């Protein structure tokens, strides 16, 4: 999705095996190696495309055209911000006008506000890194019995021996 109109994918009732992600050029959690030990009420994956020099704006305490007018994250945000270069996917010669961002607004956005009430990105394959497109996914963690949890590991079953067992807890 365009950053001015970012989309939210809701993740629920499943196993969040975060090792498929952790093990991207940016992987900053607000510990990334302990994600598999946590349960959540919900996990939301907010998907959008921005410029390289705008990636730094996708964080708590940050300001700027994206942070203030397109995609705002709260100072008390809990979750992970993951991003990677998409120069060979979202760029066109002359500028890919499919992706747009808000340049002007009367006031700043609230956290996770989606205002689609607008300028195109000049995304080109020959742009400098700061002006290349990046695909950004922000995983917001909502902390119910919880429906999103990490994977369980297992061994095997050994019989006719004294063993220390754990059967589903």
């Amino acid at each position: 999705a365009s950053v001015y109109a970012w989309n939210r994918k809701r993740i629920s009732n499943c196993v969040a095996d975060y090792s498929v992600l952790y093990n991207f050029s940016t992987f900053k959690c607000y510990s990334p190696t302990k994600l598999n030990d946590l349960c959540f009420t919900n996990v939301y994956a907010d998907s959008f495309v921005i410029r390289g020099d705008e990636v730094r704006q996708i964080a708590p305490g940050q300001t700027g055209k994206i942070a203030d007018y397109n995609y705002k994250l709260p100072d008390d945000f809990t979750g992970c911000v993951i991003a990677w270069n998409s120069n060979n996917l979202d760029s066109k010669v002359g500028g890919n006008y499919n992706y747009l961002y808000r340049l002007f607004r009367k006031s700043n956005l609230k956290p996770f506000e989606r205002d689609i009430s607008l300028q195109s990105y000049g995304f080109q394959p020959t742009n400098g890194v700061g002006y290349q497109p990046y695909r950004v996914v922000v995983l917001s963690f909502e902390l119910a019995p919880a429906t999103v949890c990490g994977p369980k590991k297992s061994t095997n079953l050994v019989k006719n021996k004294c063993v220390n067992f754990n059967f589903n807890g």
Partner: antibody, heavy 120, light 108 residues
Framework: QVQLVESGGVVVQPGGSLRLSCAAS????????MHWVRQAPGKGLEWVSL????????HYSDSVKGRFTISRDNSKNSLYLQMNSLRTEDTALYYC???????????????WGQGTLVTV | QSVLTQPPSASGTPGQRVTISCSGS????????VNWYQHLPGTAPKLLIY???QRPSGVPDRFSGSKSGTSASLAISGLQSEDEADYYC??????????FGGGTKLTV
């Protein structure tokens, strides 16, 4: 990544004419208003003219009004300035610049080209 | 030989703050907005401030301005040696078209 490239910075005899050309890329061309600004040597910036995206309106500074013509070709992503009845007073560094955004207009914004030198 | 009036120069010690004033008629500032440019010798002018107090991408919060009455000003704080540039005041006029001032030379 907005780029503007000027051409036509040549020396012309007074009483003659010269056309300047600005190539544009890195942004939507056909929806944006564009402006020309010139800087005479030893002086500050002097505004020349603007043409809107649809040709809806054109404006000239009095010193060039009636003698300069501004036009654009949205199929080539290019802006042109035709300056006739030239005087030695028109010697200046000419810059190509775009406005702040689409549709409307005011003054030249952040993206300026390097410019080219016009001598009369 | 200009409509918008500015001082010829400004100066100060790095780390300090200076201001550059701009004035004109009600048809220049009073009924319109004021933009500012920072022109570094060797290249083109770039937009610094627009619509009185807004900034374009790439311009830090050390640069700000305001408009009141029939006058306007640019404030430059945290002076750096890299800001030794000519600053310009511009506005759209009701009688004339695009109006630029003489420019103010800011030096270390």
């Amino acid at each position: 990544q907005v780029q503007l490239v000027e051409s036509g910075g040549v020396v012309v005899q007074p009483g003659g004419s010269l056309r300047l050309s600005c190539a544009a890329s890195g942004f939507t061309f056909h929806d944006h208003t564009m402006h020309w600004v010139r800087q005479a040597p030893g002086k500050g910036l002097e505004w020349v003219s603007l043409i809107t995206w649809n040709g809806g309106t054109i404006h000239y500074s009095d010193s060039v009004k009636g003698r300069f013509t501004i036009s654009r070709d949205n199929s080539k992503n290019s802006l042109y300035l035709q300056m006739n009845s030239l005087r030695t007073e028109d010697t200046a560094l000419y810059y190509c610049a775009k406005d702040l955004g689409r549709g409307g207009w005011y003054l030249p914004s952040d993206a300026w080209g390097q410019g080219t030198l016009v001598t009369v | 030989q200009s409509v918008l009036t500015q001082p010829p120069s400004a100066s100060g010690t790095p780390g300090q703050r200076v201001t550059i004033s701009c004035s004109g008629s009600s048809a220049n500032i009073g009924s319109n907005t004021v933009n500012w440019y920072q022109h570094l010798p060797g290249t083109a002018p770039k937009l610094l401030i627009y619509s009185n107090n807004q900034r374009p991408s790439g311009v830090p919060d050390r640069f700000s301005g305001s408009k009141s009455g029939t006058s306007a000003s640019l404030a430059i704080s945290g002076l750096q040696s890299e800001d030794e540039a000519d600053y310009y005041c511009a506005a759209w006029d009701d009688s004339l078209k695009g109006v630029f001032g003489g420019g103010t030379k800011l030096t270390v």
